[PDB]
Symmetry: C3
């Protein structure tokens, strides 16, 4: 039983009309998120943590914004595809932990649904998916309501 | 032997008269920390990493600022209580690592005491508790002396 | 088989003439990095994650900027020395994951070389070293091109 750790981080700036997509869930908000994809900060960061633990780089090394086969995809498709490739290397899920960093909107009413999505997408028990949120007390780009950041850690078994 | 990873993050803005409480230790400083609790950034982040690894959410899902049974509590009481509940689910401590991010005050004279507190609170060997500090070279809200951030990772055994 | 987790974080401000050193690799850029050492943000953060997992503190607790035996050293020497001391306590490498946070320069052409360096320095398979990069979408000190941050997680075996 060999175990492997992975870390992920992601940021998107606010812009345009709401809602926003975080952890798969459509959340109502005054602004939306500027992004090439659906801008799901929490799922990008989670994917990068998963891929990192499998030493497969990051999303931008598997699915280039520029090209070729994976354009106009929502972050759940990318998560599920990354997870196929991680399973292809003979890994199974240990567990994942996600930390959303945003002044607003309010995340925790939506966390149960984020966990349902992630557990479906990775085909695991909800009990192995943890998601949490925090503000930076009106400090920083995130606290000035300029954008949202997220951190993810993942553990994989072989 | 199943192992589980957890991550935590926390920020508090400076305000009011010093001292500040970081990792349990009262540290002298020109300003204090604005917070509902004692504002112990390092212990919040550690608790969230612990709870996250046990898939129990975060502090704000166990001990709502709003309510009900756990108001006006210092961060060590919250840490110790979270640790009871994590033990209640049959987990024991692997180890924890804490990273304080602050331009000032100077953290490392206080780290040995922070480790004594944390090891007591979690009833473990000092050898499983690591705490470190870093500045952001006068960059960012943290570098402009606006506040303090902290990151924690935790590993739990079952 | 006991396993241990570690986290690291590091920031350096831009200044002076390029190039910059990130993960051992000399990368061309309009500015350089202000630092006492070579300013290799990615290797500092990795070292701190490694040392943290071994409960040995951080670089600034093993190799004080002030003093005594380890001045004017490039970050690879420090990484290799920290790794001797971690091996001295009977640890072997699980794996490491690195996340560079910079608006520019562009990191991923250089990641393969960063992995060659790190794998050499820790005497491990490339397959246990993962490095990735992300921007913060022009947000924050990092997005305003003021500096570069990095995050590292490490896992150690005993
Ligand atoms: N300094 C930097 C900053 C970011 N990047 C990124 O290039 C992108 C790949 O198209 C990005 O992937 P990402 O969109 O964050 O999934 C990261 O690899 C990079 O390569 N160098
Ligand atoms: N966008 C956000 C940002 C922060 N939060 C927080 O609500 C708080 C619960 O009272 C907070 O918990 P915390 O005070 O960080 O322990 C986190 O869950 C949240 O729910 N949504
Ligand atoms: N509030 C803070 C912020 C940073 N520090 C740092 O002191 C330095 C040791 O010379 C630093 O180590 P570093 O240069 O980040 O490897 C960290 O321990 C500290 O001790 N207290
Ligand atoms: C790992 C960390 C620190 C996560 C939190 C992200 C955050 C709030 C950064 C602060 O923004 P900034 O310092 O990059 O920009 P500014 O100087 O405008 O506050
Ligand atoms: Zn993204
Ligand atoms: Zn707090
Ligand atoms: Zn440094």
């Amino acid at each position: 039983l060999e175990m492997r750790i992975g870390h992920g981080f992601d940021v998107h700036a606010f812009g345009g009309e709401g809602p926003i997509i975080i952890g798969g869930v459509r959340i109502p908000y005054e602004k939306g998120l500027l992004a090439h994809s659906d801008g799901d900060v929490a799922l990008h960061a989670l994917t990068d943590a998963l891929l990192g633990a499998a030493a497969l780089g990051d999303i931008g090394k598997l699915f280039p914004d520029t090209d070729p086969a994976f354009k106009g995809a929502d972050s759940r498709e990318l998560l599920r595809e990354a997870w196929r490739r991680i399973q292809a290397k003979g890994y199974t899920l240990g567990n994942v932990d996600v930390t959303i960093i945003a002044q607003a909107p309010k995340m925790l009413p939506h966390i149960p649904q984020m966990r349902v999505f992630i557990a479906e997408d990775l085909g695991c028990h909800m009990d192995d998916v943890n998601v949490k949120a925090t503000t930076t007390e009106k400090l920083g780009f995130t606290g000035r309501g300029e954008g949202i950041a997220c951190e993810a850690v993942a553990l994989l078994i072989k």
